[PDB]
Structures are given as C-alpha cells and as structure tokens.
C-alpha cells in the first residue's frame, strides 16, 4: 500500500483510523526542508502539512513520486502554487472550518482596546492598589464610548462578512475596501464601500485586516501609509504577519500617533517580548497565533483533510477533488 507522510507533526490519532486500509501513515516532525527523511523523498504519494513549514520550487523538485498536497487550514501562501502545477502536483485545503472562531476572536481584541480589561487585570497582579475614585480614573484612563465610531475593514471575505454583522449590534459604522468583488454586494448587507485604500484610512478610527497574502500586497501597512491614518487610531491584525511592517509600527506607538495595537500573527515566529523590533513598545497585546483553535473545530478540519487523501488515491485527479486551488495551473 502507498505511503502518506505528515511533514510537521507527531500526533496522528484521528487520521489513522481513516487511512488504515488504503495507505500507510507516517510522520516526520520536521521543522525545515532539510529534516525530511530520504525514504519520504522517494516513496511518498501524498503529504499533510501545517503552516509551520515553507516549500519552494527547489524543495518540490526533490520529490520523485508526490502527487497531491493537502493543507490543513485555509491559507496556502507558504506553498508555491504555480510551480507545483507545472510539475503535476495538486494542492488542496479546508476552506471554512473556523470561520466563526476567528470572527469571535477578532471581536474580543476590539473590545479589549476600548474597554481596557487585559491591562487592568495585569496591573492587579503586579501589586497595584486602587481605593479612591480618583485612582480609578487614572489607572483606567483612555477608555472610550463605542457608539458613534467608524470601523474600517480591508477584505470582505468569509471572516470579513462575519465581523461586519456582529459589529453593527454595538453601534459601529462600518466601511470596507475590496477591489476584487462585484457590484452590489454592499447593497445586500447594507454597508458602505470605498474605492481607494487612502480614502479608507482617512475616515477610520479602527482598522482590521482580513485579506490574503498574495504578491501584490506585501508590507501593505508600510512607513508611507502609516502616516495617513488618523491621530490616535487602533490597529488589529489576525490574517497574516507579512502585511504589516513591524519596524514602522514600533515608532508610531512610541510617538503616540497610534493609541494601541492588538496582534495575533507576526513576521517572525515564535514571538517573544524580549526580542525583535517590538522589544519595548507601549500599549501592545499579543497572542501566540491561536485565533482558530476550538475543541470542535480541531476535530472537524483533521477528518476532512484525511478523507480528501482517500478520494484521490481511489479516484482520479482532479475530477474527484472538491477543493483544488491550482486547477488552472495543473497540466
């Protein structure tokens, strides 16, 4: 029976009962392309990978029997899609398994910036004591009123639409910018649409990123664009780490042009408060790239990926595949 390898992982308790009578399962627990066993590079038909490993064209050419790659998740920016098509390799993913989990996490970060709650809890553990009313007004200085504010969204996808519906219940005013959508999408949802990125930044009090990382939007929030935002705005990023230039963001926080920022993904991972350009920057909230995890979501995405492999082995490519992203490039 053929061989299926998990490139970066050690636990295979969910995939094993599915792919036990049609293939042979193995894992490598690799952290780089140089830690892959020689047997895998010669006798592998399919592979499963998370977001912790990146494959380039040179890495793909080292495989001699690979036919399909399945990505456990929704993002595939770490795989060279066009190059894999020429070599005759199909790429698949799980489109929507954690849409609502990510939308809820985005709303949690927004509320923490307005109604300061993480910072107040952190202060108590450090030993701060507040008794009088005047002390209360000082430790919690900076809180604002949500109703009447404007929320700007970059990229109205699956997650972007979910955030917009929940934000209207709190009294926000919602704008969005998306150049790849058709006409009249905002009419159905009752939103407002702008045509340029500069116009969105001029009239926004809080900016959230929900777009994809293609080759035309690397370092979207660069030094030049960060000076076009309002005086004392917020910034939330939960899509990808390559969309924000951290070197320019650190200077804005120190000078006071940006009141705060909540980040879930960073350029270099894993993240540490003692290293990087953000070593000493006030008003910062960070999480270890866990805006997708849930007890139900984890099981659902692992079972779906396993069944995609089984259809490819016992069928034809790419007719039997449901979610293929390089069908045009495939030859």
């Amino acid at each position: 029976r053929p061989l299926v390898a998990l490139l970066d992982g050690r636990d295979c308790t969910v995939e094993m009962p599915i792919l036990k009578d049609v293939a042979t399962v193995a894992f490598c627990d690799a952290q780089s392309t140089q830690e892959i066993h020689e047997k895998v590079l010669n006798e592998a038909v399919g592979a499963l990978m998370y977001h912790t490993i990146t494959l380039t064209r040179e890495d793909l050419e080292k495989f001699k029997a690979l036919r399909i790659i399945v990505r456990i998740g929704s993002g595939f920016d770490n795989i060279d899609i066009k190059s894999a098509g020429d070599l005759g390799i199909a790429v698949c993913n799980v489109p929507a398994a954690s849409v609502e989990e990510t939308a809820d996490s985005t709303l949690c970060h927004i509320l923490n910036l307005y109604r300061r709650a993480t910072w107040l809890h952190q202060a108590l553990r450090e030993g701060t004591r507040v008794q009088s009313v005047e002390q209360i007004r000082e430790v919690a200085s900076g809180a604002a009123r949500i109703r009447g504010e404007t929320l700007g969204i970059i990229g109205l996808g699956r997650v972007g639409q979910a955030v917009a519906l929940r934000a209207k219940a709190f009294g926000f005013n919602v704008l969005f910018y998306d150049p790849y959508l058709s006409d009249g999408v905002e009419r159905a949802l009752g939103l407002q649409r702008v045509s340029t990125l500069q116009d969105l930044l001029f009239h926004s009090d809080c900016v959230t990123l929900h777009c994809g990382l293609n080759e035309h939007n690397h370092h979207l929030i660069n030094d030049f664009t960060v000076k076009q935002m309002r005086q004392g705005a917020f910034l939330v990023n939960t899509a990808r780490g390559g969309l924000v230039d951290e070197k320019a963001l650190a200077q804005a926080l120190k000078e006071g042009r940006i009141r705060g920022a909540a980040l879930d993904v960073h350029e270099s991972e894993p993240f540490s408060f003692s290293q990087g350009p953000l070593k000493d920057a006030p008003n910062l909230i960070c999480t270890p790239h866990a805006a997708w995890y849930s007890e139900q979501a984890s099981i659902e995405m692992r079972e779906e990926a396993a069944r995609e492999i089984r259809r490819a082995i016992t069928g034809r490519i790419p007719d039997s595949l449901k979610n293929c992203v390089n069908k045009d490039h495939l030859t």
Binding site: A26, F27, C28
Partner: peptide, 22 residues
C-alpha cells in the same frame, strides 16, 4: 507534556504510525 518515566524502554508494543523522524 506527560513525563516519560519509561525506565525499561523496551519495544514490545508497535502501536501506530511509522516513526521516520531525523
């Protein structure tokens, strides 16, 4: 994160995937 106090590290149980880690 369970601590591996498997002193008598024998191999009388081949129960799962093939380990090909380098």
């Amino acid at each position: 994160e369970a601590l591996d106090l498997s002193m008598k590290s024998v191999p009388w149980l081949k129960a799962g995937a093939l380990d090909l880690s380098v």
